Symmetry: C3
Subunit: 414 residues, 3 copies
């Protein structure tokens, strides 16, 4: 129309040509490495410039002018087929996934560029965020048996309904509840079921008993992202890092968006419920990120909280968005930039934790706290609080930049 | 189109059913579900009509945003100009004579309306400006206040001294519990304090109580009148919204005047610093007020709480403002779980600047009134309030609040 | 075209007639002083009204529809020539600068009105802010020699590259690093060089050894604005108060905006780096304001922090924007409105300072902290943090109002 799509198509062609004619990654010469790096850079710069003016038109083709809610996975897949060279195809990602991270060309970065541009749009952004708040198909599929049975066993999460509480137990006993793509799917499924189940009034997140010998018999909340999978190239930008932030973690804040199915939808299109978190052992990385979103947080006297995501190379999700509000900008930089670790019994733990109780009194204090969040008044108040604490624009703008900043960190030399 | 026609139909089915059905509380199970269903269909259409037509509606009522109408006048004019969108004065009269439990909930329609108005980037700021303008009552009382320095109201006693507007909340029988009259007296007093050129600083304090448990003792505020709430005397528009957009917002941003003085081009609103002194306790609406003052003092024996949650409603704009003072953990402890903060515990310093023994309190109040005098304080507190609470932030909150609070006003746990 | 430019031209003409025919400032009568004050007020009111509707058109003429980046000094100069009477000429400002503050007509206020209107625009505002993030010509000029030698000596700042650290030493040993127009130019130049030098990974700001007899041999961070120059009329609204906020202080937050010169510009158009501050003695006023944008802050056990500006009659830069986020609204008003002074060893110092060290361990603790901020991961995380903490709209809206509020404080009576 005015040159950008054609110039991008060309820049992507030069990339495919070099990737076809050059040696494999570990065999390229210094001159060859600079040649491909420059080609990638020229294509990505044009991906940004194309979308600065054409993002809404692209999103409209993919969503039929914002009448079809597409989740992240479906969105980036449809974008690849409808706009070749804008974002990688399923195949090109398949090739990337079989390689070690160091040998990857970095095609996920193109998805970072795309999702940044979509979320920056005041029209496309809120619509994509709504799509991710809708219930997952898996959860709709499991909902009737959960209502009948009160119990669902998944690979990384055990869900149980007892006394109007949805009890989510993170139960990866071999690896201290380290996070991967499967844990995100199980968590979102369980969060969806907790919110849609009419016999659930409050949610509870806790780590289960561990089996690994260093922690046998001990509960552990979360050791954060699976560093092995990160190194091997098993951590997906879209299906893990973005999915968790826009899916289950955002649903803890704002609920699940339903269809116009029920009375009161005109005032409450989303079903939200209060959430309690109980921390045993420690909350590290992604686990600690979760605590910034709960209505009540309890911890054992011996627990600690840290975000070592820094020195590790990557951004701790939306902790950079939320932590300042809890601890102020000095402490939030101490934790995020310099890896400060906060112990449950030091005074500043009160910035993250409501109750710190000795292991022998912890179970009973958890139970008491589940009784204190029951009514419709709690729902209205937590909704107004979350609206004040984190505006839709605030969250949307952060996740937009995050999509690309985190994509780049995923492929940095660190 | 038809958007307005379908609403007109849905409201007609409501009026039909209300005319032919039994009085509330002797309707059968089938009858109660039918009217509930009719209300729901009408309210759903009120929302969608206004999602696309709010600006056009507001423009008809305000002559394209060239007439400032306050809340009461706005919803009245909306009812006559758009029958079935919001209740008439009469229908509200009928609602008010009933107990909360027997009400049909017509105030919810006003919640729907004010939500849509405040959501508009054009209508919203204009309505908020209208509510920052001086009340007619205050313009009426201003000359005598300037001459006399003294105005005795129902729940408030204004008094000018050494350049201080001394507001004393003086409902000695009921611990300064809030009602529609107290809001009118407070806004009137705040308007006079800001318009009186001999006033440099404002002071809010509770007066000596007469009720026997507190005779001789000052008490700041026991919050909303729970008796009146149960009886249906708490108005969504004239109490809950009026206080947030009127006097409480004026404490933050001042009164908007006409272009009738020098410097209006840079300061269209007259704002002044405010000091609050808490005796006994600040509960509910009283505690909400502390989040808006430039200095807060409290007696050693005072406490602060927002039981508005336990009651069944939202504590005004505390959900907007408290997180900024105490962070999201403490603010949920106070609002969701009813935590009560004592003047002498460390975290009181998140809400209170000075905690003084009763015998040194009067003198510490006086000293604090001398420290906020200049034009430099005005400029700095204006920049601080602009940073702390953006116009969009407040507008977006009050928009959702208008409807969320309307629904809580008619929820079943409140009808206790 | 709508009457506003002509009415402004008239109002400015009546000002000029009166200034030509009236006595000099200290010889005017009561009636004469009221008349010129009224003429100024009418002209300034029209400057505001003209720009409320015409600001974008004005900015577009000056910047060729936002395709030429002009810094503040160049912008207001071009505006004076292209729109006579909107803002003062270089000629008129020269006359103002030759007078004491009390005798000035206040023409800088017109620049406050102009910059407020520009920054309020969602189109012009971000574009002006980008222009001020671009490298200064002086820094581009000094960059090659800095890369070669690793060392630059300026009047108020000594810059040294060492172990990948840009070491900025504020070195006004005679006056405790009091700020003036030259210090702003040196600071922005040094910050530009630190960001553009590829051998610089982290920045460090510290005060040098003092020579004044009360502090001989002792380091001092900053005593804030030069109060002597303020009284004499040597503090420029544009070249000092606005320049520092939109130039080097904003560059500490967001980096320098470069040309499309380098790989990765499509994702990082600005070069940002982490900054460490080390406070010896005290940080007062503008010095304390700087601590609010650093990534790590260290302080001597004996240091204190204060913003006595308010007591002086002026606003402490963007402290009113940033401080609440560090200390909450109670403490931020205690510091800004009531002049509270925070000592490095009291508990609430931890709201501003990461480490408080005894003088004998301070040098080594500074060195340790410089090694801890090296990677690309730190860069991405501090970028996301700063985006969350302070939005572009938030900063832009604040600086817009600040431009005029601070201009008025510059000419208020308690400042003179
Ligand atoms: C220090 C300690 C807490 C305890 O140390 P013992 O000596 O008590 O424990 P053993 O080490 O014996 O524990 C038994 C087994 O569990 C494994 N394992 C542990 N954590 C992880 C992990 N994050 N990813 C993968 N595996 C993990 C451990 O490697 C070992 O493997 P073996 O059985 O093959 O030997 C430990 O967990 C520790 O050092 N943890 C490191 C945690 C860490 O740095 N996490 C990264 C934070 S960063 C993070 O989460 C980024 C993030 C960003 C986002 O945008 C979203 C998100 O969701 C996450
Ligand atoms: C705990 C204590 C404060 C003290 O307990 P003693 O034992 O010291 O005190 P006695 O109970 O003897 O009190 C002496 C006299 O004062 C009367 N009275 C007090 N408050 C109210 C009221 N709100 N409405 C009406 N009357 C009231 C009390 O009835 C009695 O009069 P008699 O003798 O004529 O019966 C107690 O009063 C107490 O629990 N009060 C309820 C406090 C409370 O939770 N209020 C509502 C919070 S909720 C709130 O404010 C929501 C709110 C939301 C908004 O969006 C805006 C807004 O503006 C408000
Ligand atoms: C408190 C103390 C530090 C006490 O220290 P001793 O009493 O032991 O030390 P001596 O005071 O003798 O120190 C030796 C010499 O240093 C000179 N000097 C010092 N400060 C300044 C200054 N701000 N401006 C100019 N000169 C200054 C002073 O003249 C003196 O005499 P010599 O002329 O013979 O050299 C004192 O200096 C003191 O009270 N300082 C005032 C601090 C103050 O109010 N600052 C302004 C706050 S307000 C402020 O910064 C507003 C502001 C707003 C903005 O938007 C941007 C911005 O950048 C600033």
């Amino acid at each position: 129309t005015d040159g950008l799509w054609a110039a991008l198509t060309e820049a992507a062609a030069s990339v495919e040509k070099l990737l076809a004619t050059l040696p494999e990654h570990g065999a390229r010469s210094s001159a060859e490495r600079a040649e491909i790096a420059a080609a990638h850079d020229a294509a990505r710069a044009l991906r940004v410039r194309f979308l600065d003016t054409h993002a809404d038109a692209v999103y409209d083709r993919l969503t039929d002018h914002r009448r079809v809610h597409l989740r992240l996975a479906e969105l980036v897949e449809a974008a690849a087929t409808a706009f070749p060279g804008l974002v990688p195809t399923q195949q090109q990602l398949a090739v990337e996934r079989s390689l070690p991270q160091a040998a990857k060309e970095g095609h996920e970065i193109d998805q970072g560029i795309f999702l940044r541009a979509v979320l920056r749009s005041p029209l496309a952004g809120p619509h994509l965020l709504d799509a991710m708040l809708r219930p997952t198909p898996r959860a709709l599929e499991l909902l009737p048996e959960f209502v009948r049975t009160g119990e669902v066993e998944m690979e990384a999460v055990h869900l149980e309904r007892r006394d109007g509480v949805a009890r989510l137990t993170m139960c990866r006993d071999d690896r201290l509840n380290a996070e991967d793509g499967q844990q995100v799917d199980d968590m979102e499924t369980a969060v969806d079921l907790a919110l849609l189940d009419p016999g659930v009034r409050v949610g509870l997140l806790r780590g289960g008993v561990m089996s690994h010998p260093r922690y046998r018999g001990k509960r552990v909340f979360s050791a954060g992202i699976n560093l092995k999978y990160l190194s091997q190239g098993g951590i997906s930008l879209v299906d893990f890092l973005m999915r968790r932030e826009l899916g289950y973690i955002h649903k803890l804040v704002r609920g699940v968006l339903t269809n116009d199915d029920r009375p009161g939808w005109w005032h409450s299109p989303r079903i939200e419920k209060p959430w309690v978190a109980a921390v045993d052992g420690f909350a590290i990385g992604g686990g600690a990120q979760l605590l910034l979103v709960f209505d009540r947080v309890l911890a054992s006297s011996d627990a600690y909280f840290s975000l070592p995501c820094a020195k590790e190379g990557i951004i701790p999700g939306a902790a950079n968005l939320r932590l300042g509000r809890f601890a102020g900008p000095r402490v939030s930089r101490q934790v995020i930039l310099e890896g400060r670790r906060i112990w449950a019994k030091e005074p500043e733990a009160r910035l993250l934790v409501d109750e710190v109780v000795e292991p022998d009194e912890l179970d009973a204090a958890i139970e008491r706290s589940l009784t204190r969040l029951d009514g419709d008044a709690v729902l209205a108040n937590r909704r107004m609080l979350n609206l004040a604490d984190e505006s839709p624009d605030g969250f949307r703008a952060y996740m937009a930049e995050f999509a690309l900043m985190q994509a780049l960190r995923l492929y940095g030399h660190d």
